[PDB]
Amino acid sequence: GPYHIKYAKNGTHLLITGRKGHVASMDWRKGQLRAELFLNETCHSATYLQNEQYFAVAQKKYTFIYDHEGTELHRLKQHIEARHLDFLPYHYLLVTAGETGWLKYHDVSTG
């Protein structure tokens, strides 16, 4: 702990990210664990992308995009020290802000 929680837009899935680096994605109604990462790192926040298939985690210095089963897809080298994450569902933009005081918009579809 402590644990930051972000529900899916339709409320079917729960994404949890512990400060010490325990990240889990689960369907809380049926109690099925879609993915569980034990990153030995400091995780600040996480968010779901367009749907439960992909989610993003803001780790010590870089943001990582993960798959439904927990497979790492991308390491966002451009986003540095991000502490807050948000996803604009209609625009497919991922937004980050942190200690750098830089607001970065990233298109998940085209990358």
Partner: protein
Amino acid sequence: TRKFGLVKRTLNTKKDQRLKKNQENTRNIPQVSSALFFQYNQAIKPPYQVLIDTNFINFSIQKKVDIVRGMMDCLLAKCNPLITDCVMAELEKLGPKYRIALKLARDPRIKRLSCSHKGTYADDCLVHRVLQHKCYIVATNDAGLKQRIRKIPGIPLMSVGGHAYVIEKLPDV
């Protein structure tokens, strides 16, 4: 019991199906035609069927050689010249400059052959027809096309040279 040599799960580019490059991934020996005795085409006989190439019509006009009469003179037999849709399409694409050649190509004596392929490239269409059936004479002056037909055995090759037509691979002459 934690396992040894633990690694972070990551996308495997070479073995992941979802990626496009990974996603994508009875012998036939054609019979030699029964109409062909080694290099000699025994089956072919008069009246002959001749496929007209686009360049052939242009040169025939240049030398004042009529298509039907010139064919009868060269082979001393009745010839049924045939123009495929490709050759007709090539003539039309040539432009207003070659309107004379288009008019002669539409002569009623020149019979028409339909085509069932998308492209308009006529060199490939002619070569496919001769390979399947050994019953056509190829009338062309294109250097490239003539070499292709020469490699195919038993395909008489006709050309316009000098003042009249010339037939190369037709033993009965």
